[PDB]
């Protein structure tokens, strides 16, 4: 028994349409055959197509487009359908579907002109309704509507490679764990020995003023040079608090609460990072409330560290990769690092305007994808390392804080099939089109540059 519906069309074009009508017809109970849904690329398809036209097809639909009227396969299928129509004496065996507004009725094959085509040009819904009316008037066999079948076919055929697949993925983070801490946190009771107007940020080692005390991991003698009044200070007057007890939450005394000690340790980590950055001779860029550190042009051989470029060019302006770090303790004692891009005119002198920096950063980062960000961050962090495994944040003459150069790695159990990066380039090109609705206030600074 002939109960199938045949939709003939072009492969590269006439692809999106066939999909809509086919799914729509199958969802309405019609048994439909089209090479998009039932043909696996690589097999000799002509024998199967000829068999389905000759043996199982009741209505033959040909999509009449500009490329449909010239494609060789469409013409062969139409010839087979014409032979079958002559055999069956069914003058309505071939039902044309006109979808191209530029296809005149004289450009349609002379065999197809005599058949009343269904107007899909103006509206696809009206064409579908006309097709359904014609099918009802011709008693085309159909089953009760089951849209689940169309949904299942869509998911199986056009979403096979477009689903999350199970595969372990290792993700590098921007959290760099702290291997060790100094044994004790010390509160030196300097009182008068510390003038009330002394800026503790000028000390050679991190320190914080807390009441009449000085909170640091460093010893009393580490500040004799810069605070000569502390030469006569007794070491037994210091309140030494174990760091492990602070971090583990077991520290409970009336002198100071545990969260205050953790906050002081965070501030000391930040100060040690600032001093380490000043020790590495990296420039400073003042952000809203924190500092970003970037590398000056010509500091690194060919502006590259381990074959990774850190200083480059962007039109007439130069871009620098920079990091800004803040200490964290709660999830785990890590050193949080954020990535920044900082621009200069000649490689040394900063750009004073903030909106120029913002626009240039967005423009440069649009073309920087996962690999570029990860490689540049890792290269920067390995630039700061003192050995192969960790970077040392000096906090005292004998006390140091060790931070690994290997980020805290994360792993997940679900992955994706990696496509071509041309999609990434396309999204980059398309980002500005969407951003033209929110970036109409930064267009004056660009004219200010010229």
């Amino acid at each position: 028994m002939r109960n199938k519906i045949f939709i003939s069309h072009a492969t590269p074009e006439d692809d999106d349409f066939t999909r809509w009508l086919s799914l729509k017809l199958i969802g309405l109970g019609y048994e439909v055959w089209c090479d998009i849904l039932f043909l696996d690329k690589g097999v000799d398809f002509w024998s199967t197509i000829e068999k389905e036209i000759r043996e199982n097809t009741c209505k033959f639909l040909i999509v009449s487009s500009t490329a449909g009227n010239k494609r060789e396969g469409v013409l062969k299928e139409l010839a087979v359908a014409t032979k079958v129509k002559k055999h069956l004496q069914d003058d309505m065996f071939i039902i044309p579907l006109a979808i191209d507004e530029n296809l005149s009725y004289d450009d349609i094959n002379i065999e197809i002109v005599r058949l009343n085509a269904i107007d899909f040009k103006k509206s696809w819904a009206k064409g579908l309704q006309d097709l359904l009316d014609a099918f009802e008037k011709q008693n085309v066999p159909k089953k009760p509507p089951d849209h689940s079948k169309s949904n299942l076919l869509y998911q199986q055929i056009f979403l096979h490679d477009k689903q999350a697949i199970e595969k372990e993925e290792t993700y590098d983070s921007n959290w760099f764990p702290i291997i060790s801490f100094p044994n004790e946190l010390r509160f030196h009771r300097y009182d008068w020995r510390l003038p009330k107007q002394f800026d503790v940020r000028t000390l050679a080692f991190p320190a914080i003023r807390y009441k009449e005390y000085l909170c640091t991991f460093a010893w009393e003698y580490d500040f004799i040079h810069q605070l000569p009044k502390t030469e006569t200070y007794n070491g037994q007057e210091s309140i030494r608090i174990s760091t492990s007890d602070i971090l583990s939450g077991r520290y409970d005394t009336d002198f100071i609460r545990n969260y205050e000690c953790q906050r002081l340790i965070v501030q000391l980590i930040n100060k040690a990072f600032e001093l380490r950055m000043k020790d590495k001779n990296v420039r400073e860029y003042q952000m809203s409330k924190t500092f970003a550190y970037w590398i000056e042009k010509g500091k690194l051989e060919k502006d590259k560290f381990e074959k990774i470029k850190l200083v480059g060019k962007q039109k007439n302006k130069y871009w620098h990769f920079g990091i800004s770090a803040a200490g964290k303790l709660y999830p785990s004692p890590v050193l949080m690092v954020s990535s920044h891009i900082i621009f200069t005119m000649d490689g040394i002198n900063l750009i004073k305007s903030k909106s120029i920096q913002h626009s240039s950063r967005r423009k440069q980062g649009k073309n920087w994808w996962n690999d570029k960000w990860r490689e540049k961050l890792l290269a920067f962090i390995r630039f700061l390392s003192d050995d192969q495994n960790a970077i040392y944040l000096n906090v005292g003459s004998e006390e140091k804080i060790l931070i690994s150069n290997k980020p805290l790695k994360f792993f997940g159990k679900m992955s994706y099939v990696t496509p071509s990066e041309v999609t990434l380039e396309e999204e980059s090109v398309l980002a500005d089109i969407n951003n033209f609705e929110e970036d109409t206030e930064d267009l004056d600074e660009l004219e200010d540059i010229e």
């Binding site: 103006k122 869509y154 993700y171 792993f411 999204e427 089109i433």
Partner: protein
């Protein structure tokens, strides 16, 4: 290492009970959730605007193709997608001649120019809605490019195009409202000064001011620039288009069609996996810059159940902003009133009180506000307060390849704090929704007891309920995404007393 859990992609329900992951695919294959008779479009604007609108409708009645059909699927046509007619014939048109626009467009004061133009448009819309026998489902405003360019808070008219000078300065106007007591028979000059000072009561944003002034009349509105619809006709000095939309024509048609269908009374889609008796509330805060007290702010709450069709409640205006912390908090009485209104609206709609209530906010809740919330929650209802913030950056970089981390991966710090990736690679689109490396949102359960994985799934699902733009997913849940827009619209005017509950008037 630290383990990442995976949250499956939330499916959304469509017509005939079929579920899909992409709104475009579901709309194209099965259609919207509910069908409407049609869309009776009303247009206010220039004659060129009406011609552009009619051309755009005639264009979207027929399919529009994109270069890459995977990330941005084509538009099969309005009738083939939604099943309802959107004809360009029989359109209620209220013309705004170019002379009328030029009369008010060349005023030095941005506030006065915006107020005058918005008054023109709003008066036309109101008169048409009140005196015409033909009802209009959605009113479409075709704003000319000059109005969009010169009617924004930071827009300055060049000194060559200034024809009418400003009669009052910004500081002098800000120092008029609070010291009214004009107390006198005033020369016409002082009455014009008074009128301009009153225009200073409204924001300079054209779209937001028009929405705020049209809220009280329950008139849906869609605001479209002329170059959004006919971008080929708007060329710069070099001959190239000012805005090149040749690559998102299908996406633009999808967005405009979905917005128009939603505003006309139809619901396009809804969540496929629904938890019965669950109600999400989005606590929204916006500062009133026109207040005598700098701490004053306007508080709003938005209720969503399974679709994007939400309910908006406007709270009272009072000193909610805390300058020392940069956090907003309601006093007990106002919090109780807001939550009682939300719960009573839910009881009216669904005939029974919700089983679970989730309040999403951008700041932590204090004990006073939470006790106020609990005093009005029924004993059989679970109340949970969740804060979603983007300020805690945990950037993960995939070791191999240039593509970012897949959407849906989550990191659970503890029973109440977790990281969720609403941005990243999407297997269905075979591309990424965010540039550079996506920023996860930080999800924290401060108050109440609730399982963290269920909250993550609910937030990922709520990400799918943006009816203003037919995109696959947003960066934030719908309970918080429209916080800024709704706050700005509510605060654009100080004369809004009883705004409407329906969500379609705020976007």
């Amino acid at each position: 290492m630290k383990e990442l859990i995976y949250i499956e992609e939330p499916s959304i329900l469509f017509a005939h009970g079929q579920k899909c992951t992409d709104p475009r695919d579901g709309l194209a294959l099965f259609g919207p959730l509910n069908q409407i008779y049609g869309i009776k479009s009303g247009v206010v604007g220039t004659q060129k605007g009406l011609q552009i609108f009619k051309s755009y409708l005639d264009k979207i009645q027929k399919p529009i193709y994109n270069h890459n059909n995977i990330t941005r699927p084509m538009f099969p046509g309005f009738e083939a997608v939604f099943g309802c007619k959107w004809e360009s014939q029989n359109i209620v048109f209220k013309e705004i001649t170019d002379e009328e626009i030029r009369r008010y467009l060349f005023n030095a004061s941005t506030h006065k120019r915006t107020y005058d133009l918005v008054t023109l448009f709003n008066d036309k819309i109101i008169t048409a809605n009140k005196n015409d026998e033909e009802r209009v489902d959605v009113w479409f405003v075709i704003v000319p490019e000059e109005i969009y360019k010169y009617c924004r808070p930071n827009s300055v008219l060049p000194n060559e195009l200034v024809q009418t000078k400003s009669l009052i300065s910004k500081s002098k106007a800000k120092s008029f409202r609070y010291t009214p007591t004009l107390f006198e028979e005033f020369n016409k000059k002082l009455k014009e000064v008074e009128k301009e000072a009153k225009t200073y009561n409204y924001d300079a944003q054209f779209h937001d001011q028009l929405k705020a002034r049209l809220l009280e009349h329950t008139i849906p509105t869609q605001i479209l620039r002329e170059s959004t619809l006919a971008w080929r006709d708007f060329k710069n000095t070099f001959g190239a288009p000012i805005r090149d939309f040749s690559k998102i024509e299908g996406h633009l048609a999808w967005t405009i069609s979905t917005a128009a269908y939603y505003k006309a009374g139809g619901k396009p889609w809804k969540l496929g996996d629904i938890r019965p008796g669950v109600c999400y509330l989005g606590l929204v805060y916006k500062k009133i810059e026109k207040s005598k007290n700098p701490q004053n702010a306007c508080c709003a709450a938005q209720m969503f159940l399974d679709n994007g069709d939400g309910t908006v409640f406007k709270g009272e205006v009072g000193p909610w902003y805390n300058p020392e912390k940069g956090e907003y908090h309601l006093k007990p009485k106002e919090a109780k009133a807001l939550l009682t209104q939300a719960l009573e609206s839910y009881k009216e709609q669904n005939k029974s009180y919700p089983k679970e209530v989730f309040i999403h906010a951008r700041t932590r809740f204090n004990d006073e506000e939470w006790n106020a919330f609990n005093e009005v929650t029924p004993k059989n209802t679970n109340l949970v307060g969740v804060t979603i913030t983007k300020s805690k950056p945990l950037k993960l970089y995939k070791t191999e390849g240039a593509f970012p981390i897949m959407r849906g991966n989550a990191y659970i710090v503890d029973e109440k704090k977790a990281f969720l990736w609403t941005l990243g690679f999407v297997p269905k689109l075979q591309s990424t929704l965010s540039m550079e490396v996506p920023n996860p949102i930080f999800i924290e359960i401060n108050k109440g007891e609730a399982e963290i994985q269920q909250v993550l799934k609910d937030i990922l699902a709520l990400t799918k309920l943006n009816y203003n733009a037919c995109i696959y997913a947003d960066g934030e849940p719908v309970t918080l995404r429209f916080a800024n827009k709704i706050g700005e619209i509510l605060t654009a005017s100080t004369e809004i007393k009883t705004p409407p509950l329906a969500f379609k008037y705020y976007i």
